[PDB]
Design a protein around this ligand. Sequence first.
Ligand SMILES: [Mg+2]
Ligand SMILES: [Mg+2]
Ligand SMILES: [Mg+2]
Ligand SMILES: [Mg+2]
Ligand SMILES: [Mg+2]
Ligand SMILES: [Mg+2]
Ligand SMILES: [Mg+2]
Ligand SMILES: [Mg+2]
Ligand SMILES: [Mg+2]
Ligand SMILES: [Mg+2]
Ligand SMILES: [Mg+2]
Ligand SMILES: [Mg+2]
Ligand SMILES: [Mg+2]
Ligand SMILES: [Mg+2]
Ligand SMILES: [Mg+2]
Ligand SMILES: [Mg+2]
Ligand SMILES: [Mg+2]
Ligand SMILES: [Mg+2]
Ligand SMILES: [Mg+2]
Ligand SMILES: [Mg+2]
Ligand SMILES: [Mg+2]
Ligand SMILES: [Mg+2]
Ligand SMILES: [Mg+2]
Ligand SMILES: [Mg+2]
Ligand SMILES: [Mg+2]
Ligand SMILES: [Mg+2]
Ligand SMILES: [Mg+2]
Ligand SMILES: [Mg+2]
Ligand SMILES: [Mg+2]
Ligand SMILES: [Mg+2]
Ligand SMILES: [Mg+2]
Ligand SMILES: [Mg+2]
Ligand SMILES: [Mg+2]
Ligand SMILES: [Mg+2]
Ligand SMILES: [Mg+2]
Ligand SMILES: [Mg+2]
Ligand SMILES: [Mg+2]
Ligand SMILES: [Mg+2]
Ligand SMILES: [Mg+2]
Ligand SMILES: [Mg+2]
Ligand SMILES: [Mg+2]
Ligand SMILES: [Mg+2]
Ligand SMILES: [Mg+2]
Ligand SMILES: [Mg+2]
Ligand SMILES: [Mg+2]
Ligand SMILES: [Mg+2]
Ligand SMILES: [Mg+2]
Ligand SMILES: [Mg+2]
Ligand SMILES: [Mg+2]
Ligand SMILES: [Mg+2]
Ligand SMILES: [Mg+2]
Ligand SMILES: [Mg+2]
Ligand SMILES: [Mg+2]
Ligand SMILES: [Mg+2]
Ligand SMILES: [Mg+2]
Ligand SMILES: [Mg+2]
Ligand SMILES: [Mg+2]
Ligand SMILES: [Mg+2]
Ligand SMILES: [Mg+2]
Ligand SMILES: [Mg+2]
Ligand SMILES: [Mg+2]
Ligand SMILES: [Mg+2]
Ligand SMILES: [Mg+2]
Ligand SMILES: [Mg+2]
Ligand SMILES: [Mg+2]
Ligand SMILES: [Mg+2]
Ligand SMILES: [Mg+2]
Ligand SMILES: [Mg+2]
Ligand SMILES: [Mg+2]
Ligand SMILES: [Mg+2]
Ligand SMILES: [Mg+2]
Ligand SMILES: [Mg+2]
Ligand SMILES: [Mg+2]
Ligand SMILES: [Mg+2]
Ligand SMILES: [Mg+2]
Ligand SMILES: [Mg+2]
Ligand SMILES: [Mg+2]
Ligand SMILES: [Mg+2]
Ligand SMILES: [Mg+2]
Ligand SMILES: [Mg+2]
Ligand SMILES: [Mg+2]
Ligand SMILES: [Mg+2]
Ligand SMILES: [Mg+2]
Ligand SMILES: [Mg+2]
Ligand SMILES: [Mg+2]
Ligand SMILES: [Mg+2]
Ligand SMILES: [Mg+2]
Ligand SMILES: [Mg+2]
Ligand SMILES: [Mg+2]
Ligand SMILES: [Mg+2]
Ligand SMILES: [Mg+2]
Ligand SMILES: [Mg+2]
Ligand SMILES: [Mg+2]
Ligand SMILES: [Mg+2]
Ligand SMILES: [Mg+2]
Ligand SMILES: [Mg+2]
Ligand SMILES: [Mg+2]
Ligand SMILES: [Mg+2]
Ligand SMILES: [Mg+2]
Ligand SMILES: [Mg+2]
Ligand SMILES: [Mg+2]
Ligand SMILES: [Mg+2]
Ligand SMILES: [Mg+2]
Ligand SMILES: [Mg+2]
Ligand SMILES: [Mg+2]
Ligand SMILES: [Mg+2]
Ligand SMILES: [Mg+2]
Ligand SMILES: [Mg+2]
Ligand SMILES: [Mg+2]
Ligand SMILES: [Mg+2]
Ligand SMILES: [Mg+2]
Ligand SMILES: [Mg+2]
Ligand SMILES: [Mg+2]
Lengths: 156, 53, 222, 148, 51, 185
Amino acid sequence: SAQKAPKWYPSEDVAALKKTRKAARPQKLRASLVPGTVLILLAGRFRGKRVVYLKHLEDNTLLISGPFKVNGVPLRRVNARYVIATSTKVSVEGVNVEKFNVEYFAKEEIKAERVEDQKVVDKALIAEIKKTPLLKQYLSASFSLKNGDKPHMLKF
Amino acid sequence: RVKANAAKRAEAKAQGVAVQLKRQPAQPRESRIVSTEGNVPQTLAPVPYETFI
Amino acid sequence: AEQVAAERAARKAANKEKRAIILERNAAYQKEYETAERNIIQAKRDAKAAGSYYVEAQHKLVFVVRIKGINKIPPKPRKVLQLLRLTRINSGTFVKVTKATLELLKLIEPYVAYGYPSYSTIRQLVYKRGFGKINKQRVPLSDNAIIEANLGKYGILSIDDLIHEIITVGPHFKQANNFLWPFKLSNPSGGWGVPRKFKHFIQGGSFGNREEFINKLVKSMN
Amino acid sequence: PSRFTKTRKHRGHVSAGKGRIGKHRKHPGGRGMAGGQHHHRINMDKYHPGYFGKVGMRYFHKQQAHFWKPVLNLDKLWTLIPEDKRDQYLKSASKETAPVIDTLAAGYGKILGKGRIPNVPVIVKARFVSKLAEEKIRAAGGVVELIA
Amino acid sequence: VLKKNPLKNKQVLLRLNPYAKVFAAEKLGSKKAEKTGTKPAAVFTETLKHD
Amino acid sequence: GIDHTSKQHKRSGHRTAPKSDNVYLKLLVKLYTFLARRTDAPFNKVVLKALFLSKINRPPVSVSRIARALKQEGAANKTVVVVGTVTDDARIFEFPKTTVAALRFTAGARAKIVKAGGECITLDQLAVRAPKGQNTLILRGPRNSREAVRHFGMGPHKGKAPRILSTGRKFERARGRRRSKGFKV
RNA sequence: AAUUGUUGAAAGGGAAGGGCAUUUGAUCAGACA
RNA sequence: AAUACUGCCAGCUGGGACUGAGGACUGCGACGUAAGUCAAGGAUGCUGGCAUAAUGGUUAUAUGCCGCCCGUCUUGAAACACGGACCAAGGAGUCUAACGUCUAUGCGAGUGUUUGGGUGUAAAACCCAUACGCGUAAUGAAAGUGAACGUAGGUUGGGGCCUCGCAAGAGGUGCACAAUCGACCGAUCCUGAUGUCUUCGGAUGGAUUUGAGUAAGAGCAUAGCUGUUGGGACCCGAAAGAU
RNA sequence: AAUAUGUAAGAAGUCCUUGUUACUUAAUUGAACGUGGACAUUUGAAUGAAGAGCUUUUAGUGGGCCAUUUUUGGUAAGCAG
RNA sequence: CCCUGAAAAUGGAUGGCGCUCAAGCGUGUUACCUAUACUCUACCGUCAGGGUUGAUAUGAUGCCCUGACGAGUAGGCAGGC
Ligand SMILES: [Mg+2]
Ligand SMILES: [Mg+2]
Ligand SMILES: [Mg+2]
Ligand SMILES: [Mg+2]
Ligand SMILES: [Mg+2]
Ligand SMILES: [Mg+2]
Ligand SMILES: [Mg+2]
Ligand SMILES: [Mg+2]
Ligand SMILES: [Mg+2]
Ligand SMILES: [Mg+2]
Ligand SMILES: [Mg+2]
Ligand SMILES: [Mg+2]
Ligand SMILES: [Mg+2]
Ligand SMILES: [Mg+2]
Ligand SMILES: [Mg+2]
Ligand SMILES: [Mg+2]
Ligand SMILES: [Mg+2]
Ligand SMILES: [Mg+2]
Ligand SMILES: [Mg+2]
Ligand SMILES: [Mg+2]
Ligand SMILES: [Mg+2]
Ligand SMILES: [Mg+2]
Ligand SMILES: [Mg+2]
Ligand SMILES: [Mg+2]
Ligand SMILES: [Mg+2]
Ligand SMILES: [Mg+2]
Ligand SMILES: [Mg+2]
Ligand SMILES: [Mg+2]
Ligand SMILES: [Mg+2]
Ligand SMILES: [Mg+2]
Ligand SMILES: [Mg+2]
Ligand SMILES: [Mg+2]
Ligand SMILES: [Mg+2]
Ligand SMILES: [Mg+2]
Ligand SMILES: [Mg+2]
Ligand SMILES: [Mg+2]
Ligand SMILES: [Mg+2]
Ligand SMILES: [Mg+2]
Ligand SMILES: [Mg+2]
Ligand SMILES: [Mg+2]
Ligand SMILES: [Mg+2]
Ligand SMILES: [Mg+2]
Ligand SMILES: [Mg+2]
Ligand SMILES: [Mg+2]
Ligand SMILES: [Mg+2]
Ligand SMILES: [Mg+2]
Ligand SMILES: [Mg+2]
Ligand SMILES: [Mg+2]
Ligand SMILES: [Mg+2]
Ligand SMILES: [Mg+2]
Ligand SMILES: [Mg+2]
Ligand SMILES: [Mg+2]
Ligand SMILES: [Mg+2]
Ligand SMILES: [Mg+2]
Ligand SMILES: [Mg+2]
Ligand SMILES: [Mg+2]
Ligand SMILES: [Mg+2]
Ligand SMILES: [Mg+2]
Ligand SMILES: [Mg+2]
Ligand SMILES: [Mg+2]
Ligand SMILES: [Mg+2]
Ligand SMILES: [Mg+2]
Ligand SMILES: [Mg+2]
Ligand SMILES: [Mg+2]
Ligand SMILES: [Mg+2]
Ligand SMILES: [Mg+2]
Ligand SMILES: [Mg+2]
Ligand SMILES: [Mg+2]
Ligand SMILES: [Mg+2]
Ligand SMILES: [Mg+2]
Ligand SMILES: [Mg+2]
Ligand SMILES: [Mg+2]
Ligand SMILES: [Mg+2]
Ligand SMILES: [Mg+2]
Ligand SMILES: [Mg+2]
Ligand SMILES: [Mg+2]
Ligand SMILES: [Mg+2]
Ligand SMILES: [Mg+2]
Ligand SMILES: [Mg+2]
Ligand SMILES: [Mg+2]
Ligand SMILES: [Mg+2]
Ligand SMILES: [Mg+2]
Ligand SMILES: [Mg+2]
Ligand SMILES: [Mg+2]
Ligand SMILES: [Mg+2]
Ligand SMILES: [Mg+2]
Ligand SMILES: [Mg+2]
Ligand SMILES: [Mg+2]
Ligand SMILES: [Mg+2]
Ligand SMILES: [Mg+2]
Ligand SMILES: [Mg+2]
Ligand SMILES: [Mg+2]
Ligand SMILES: [Mg+2]
Ligand SMILES: [Mg+2]
Ligand SMILES: [Mg+2]
Ligand SMILES: [Mg+2]
Ligand SMILES: [Mg+2]
Ligand SMILES: [Mg+2]
Ligand SMILES: [Mg+2]
Ligand SMILES: [Mg+2]
Ligand SMILES: [Mg+2]
Ligand SMILES: [Mg+2]
Ligand SMILES: [Mg+2]
Ligand SMILES: [Mg+2]
Ligand SMILES: [Mg+2]
Ligand SMILES: [Mg+2]
Ligand SMILES: [Mg+2]
Ligand SMILES: [Mg+2]
Ligand SMILES: [Mg+2]
Ligand SMILES: [Mg+2]
Ligand SMILES: [Mg+2]
Ligand SMILES: [Mg+2]
Ligand SMILES: [Mg+2]
């Protein structure tokens, strides 16, 4: 032979895992995140967009809607840590939202179901957006740090 | 101290045990109330610089 | 073959019975402690109104932590540092206060900082960094039956039983103390508060007996 | 062999095990047994006291052999009898018939007396006995016989 | 295989010392003391404010 | 770093397995390392070690030394163990019964041990008979009958035998050995 | 091999070469499945 | 009344960083009326990106910081101390005689077949009688003498074993080893019985002397590392002398 | 004086009884070695003890230099002891 | 504290630039920076303490748990190439 071969070989048998003790306990949101709050979207496709916050979905994501009609942002998933939660709020107390869950957004163009749903929600908000002036404009504008803005100083 | 360590041993065994006859270092002092009657504290100070020579 | 739950029962019900003893114990020191402490507070108060002056017992127990490093140390104190198990920098042991050690303590001020531990910092030392000497093996405490197996001899069948026999310098403080493997502190968190350390405490440095303050130091090195 | 030889271990270290200071020079102490009385006198008193100078008589032309005289004690003696014939004689420890050991035939010159042989009679042909040697033989019924 | 600190880890805190449960439970660590009003002799007070 | 109080990385300094390379020897070790881990009986730890010992620390127990050991009071029925070879000794005329466990018995020795109506047991038959070593008498030979120890510790006034290669007068018997040639030891 | 010619790439404000680390250029293994 | 300061809580709580060793179960706990549950003897859950030079390795370059020529002898070298322009290939603790400690192996009061003979498939292996060598006696310059008062002694520690006790412990025996007191043999100095070819003989009991001794043998042979000595003696090196 | 340094802090201990001899006393007097007997770990301070003891054989080294303190010669020295 | 006393040879040194209610001197209070040290974890090697021949698979100088330690010339030894 060219090499003399071990006197011992490892068991190719393969153990299983010690039974871990790490419960998936549920995530509590930071108090600034309350339904009807306008978020600022820090990263992502709709980075810099202002957006109403509807529901806290079971994968911890957040349900937002532009409304679509205002700034072009759909009912959509967004992460909670990629968001500056403002202090301006609208009453989402006549918006549906129960309909919407994780599987609602399975990957599987635009489903006609979605185009309609977008309209049931967005109509409701816009009803109530219009209840305070200028708000509807605010929501169509983006957010950018201007010169001499210091986030650690600013109030959102 | 060995002739004495005999005594304390017998005189205590023939009494009802409990003896302790190992030497122990000087233990710190206990709690005490030093009284003030006929004994008000006398305030002292440092004193200036003299020469006397 | 029974044992399955039979002898599981025969112990689990006796492991119960021990914790019963421990609770009833630890609960007792608690009373002993606060009552022992309220005593002094009323003892001082009682003298003041009476006119007099309640002088406390001299401390009976000291905690020492080695400040100075390893090298360039003269033969004699270099010996005492060993007999106090302080063979490396920032480790630290308890010492029972008696003349035949008080001289030792003297002999090595330039290299240790030391003083008077509180129940709070004896507690937080044992709990967090207290190990046992069990055929050497520097063994973490972490369960009450580690103690019991080795200091159970002399009473002491719980971690707070340890603390009690330490903080009171009771009849078995030698073996209760030496059971504890020399402590192993970090550099102080805040820093040292002196600029140069190797002066006496009184002279704005870090060594020798700083007394009541040996705590804040320790609770920063822990 | 040369592969456990330490000098193989030493390959690559300047000095070869021999110090940088004190080197491996030719003959520091002198050669051989030099300075026996001088810079090497500590080693010869102790380790070798008695070394120097004379004692006793000379003995020109001393033929060892003149003084040939192997020594066997009573201590053994019985061993000069083959084991099978041996017990035959121990048991039945009598006059009339007692073994005749010719120790000079067996190659000894003196019988000494190291200690205890049983109460069995033996006839000892020897060239020379020690007092005790001969004494102990009798007290078991033996005799010595003097021979050349 | 990994030493857990009590002090921060309530579980291990009760694997040793089960009195931790009462002590938290009875607040203990914040015990109000028997208010008294004994006042010190002026001998004490004079010679405090003396010079 | 640490003020070290004891030389670090110390080797224990006791053999831990015979240095010999004898298969049979190493088997005996496996017998007794087992026996000694699982028997809480002294005799198994003593024997285990002694099997590691070098030839110098295994002096021969003679057959007469064995004979004598039995004459101890109440010892005459014990079975003697000699971890090492056992030698014959024509100097005893009698020899008793018993049963000798040993690493080796010489030709002469088992003869005399058997001839006396006796038994010669190898160390592993003794295991079977006496797992706790019940009723053994362990003998050691004499370690300082060795020639070499004569010359150990030589030096003035130690009376301790020159390392010398011929002897006689003319051979280190003058100056420094007698009052009348310089001095004496 | 020292040393040399050509060709190719690259760096070079009083030497060259090295350590830790990363940019960029070139080149490469493995690993998906 | 408040507050400050100092101290404590096994009072609550936010942000940030690094780690994730382990690999069925087994422990100590914790919460529950309970069933079960848990953060309690070491990371899992969910979601996405690429499946490639994306990550990673090698390399050149650049940039931050750091980096004196190595070897030697020396208290101290980068040294204004020596060798070294560069490459290849040679190039230095050997062998032998005789030894110390140690270890392995054989056999063991003995041990060593190998001068030799036998013999052979022929410098091998296989076999062997007589000696010899070392050991099993010492001590004296020598003439010489030559190791048991005694269970081969007494004492004190001794592992181990034996006997009692559930056990803790108590006795019993106690090898090796060590300490000590003796006894034994030779030297030396005393002592000088019974006898006697009247000077031969030296029993006996003794002595702050002495010995590389006896006191139930440990040795012989092969081998190996280290070490010793003589040899060209780790390698190169005089000025000289000689025929 | 300070600093430095000898010894001691028990089981190889302590107490009773009364054995040996040629030393020794006026003397069974004493000395020395003993048999029999009484008392255990608070059995005779503290702290430590990754144990303690023991033997054999062999390397290198045997140019030393510095610092604080004490200190000799020298005016001194990066001098010499 | 400052000034005078205060004189040497290439051009040059609070380390440099520079600094004057200091970036100077004495002293106090905090915060902050960073060693191969300290604390915690991981891995390597060393030393030690334990566990494990029970067959019917693979190493018994092996396997498994555990703790502590790691400077190095001359020099020793070891295990390897
Ligand atoms: Mg779970
Ligand atoms: Mg939460
Ligand atoms: Mg929160
Ligand atoms: Mg718009
Ligand atoms: Mg102490
Ligand atoms: Mg002390
Ligand atoms: Mg003091
Ligand atoms: Mg900090
Ligand atoms: Mg802070
Ligand atoms: Mg600080
Ligand atoms: Mg400073
Ligand atoms: Mg300093
Ligand atoms: Mg800390
Ligand atoms: Mg070879
Ligand atoms: Mg090799
Ligand atoms: Mg050789
Ligand atoms: Mg080497
Ligand atoms: Mg090498
Ligand atoms: Mg050497
Ligand atoms: Mg050289
Ligand atoms: Mg030198
Ligand atoms: Mg000399
Ligand atoms: Mg001569
Ligand atoms: Mg002559
Ligand atoms: Mg002559
Ligand atoms: Mg002779
Ligand atoms: Mg003999
Ligand atoms: Mg005689
Ligand atoms: Mg051995
Ligand atoms: Mg022996
Ligand atoms: Mg001999
Ligand atoms: Mg020798
Ligand atoms: Mg001689
Ligand atoms: Mg003299
Ligand atoms: Mg230039
Ligand atoms: Mg696959
Ligand atoms: Mg406060
Ligand atoms: Mg708190
Ligand atoms: Mg993991
Ligand atoms: Mg893992
Ligand atoms: Mg409950
Ligand atoms: Mg759980
Ligand atoms: Mg790729
Ligand atoms: Mg890449
Ligand atoms: Mg690829
Ligand atoms: Mg990538
Ligand atoms: Mg790609
Ligand atoms: Mg290139
Ligand atoms: Mg490079
Ligand atoms: Mg530099
Ligand atoms: Mg070089
Ligand atoms: Mg010089
Ligand atoms: Mg210098
Ligand atoms: Mg150099
Ligand atoms: Mg120079
Ligand atoms: Mg030169
Ligand atoms: Mg040159
Ligand atoms: Mg070459
Ligand atoms: Mg050469
Ligand atoms: Mg050797
Ligand atoms: Mg052998
Ligand atoms: Mg013989
Ligand atoms: Mg041949
Ligand atoms: Mg031929
Ligand atoms: Mg033949
Ligand atoms: Mg023949
Ligand atoms: Mg022969
Ligand atoms: Mg001899
Ligand atoms: Mg003799
Ligand atoms: Mg003579
Ligand atoms: Mg004569
Ligand atoms: Mg006699
Ligand atoms: Mg006699
Ligand atoms: Mg005696
Ligand atoms: Mg006994
Ligand atoms: Mg004599
Ligand atoms: Mg003589
Ligand atoms: Mg001799
Ligand atoms: Mg012998
Ligand atoms: Mg031998
Ligand atoms: Mg051989
Ligand atoms: Mg040589
Ligand atoms: Mg010439
Ligand atoms: Mg000449
Ligand atoms: Mg004084
Ligand atoms: Mg002293
Ligand atoms: Mg009498
Ligand atoms: Mg007695
Ligand atoms: Mg003590
Ligand atoms: Mg201790
Ligand atoms: Mg130990
Ligand atoms: Mg030496
Ligand atoms: Mg030497
Ligand atoms: Mg000299
Ligand atoms: Mg020397
Ligand atoms: Mg020299
Ligand atoms: Mg001075
Ligand atoms: Mg000088
Ligand atoms: Mg000023
Ligand atoms: Mg110049
Ligand atoms: Mg200046
Ligand atoms: Mg500066
Ligand atoms: Mg400045
Ligand atoms: Mg200042
Ligand atoms: Mg602060
Ligand atoms: Mg600040
Ligand atoms: Mg460092
Ligand atoms: Mg590090
Ligand atoms: Mg093992
Ligand atoms: Mg090293
Ligand atoms: Mg050297
Ligand atoms: Mg290796
Ligand atoms: Mg090789």
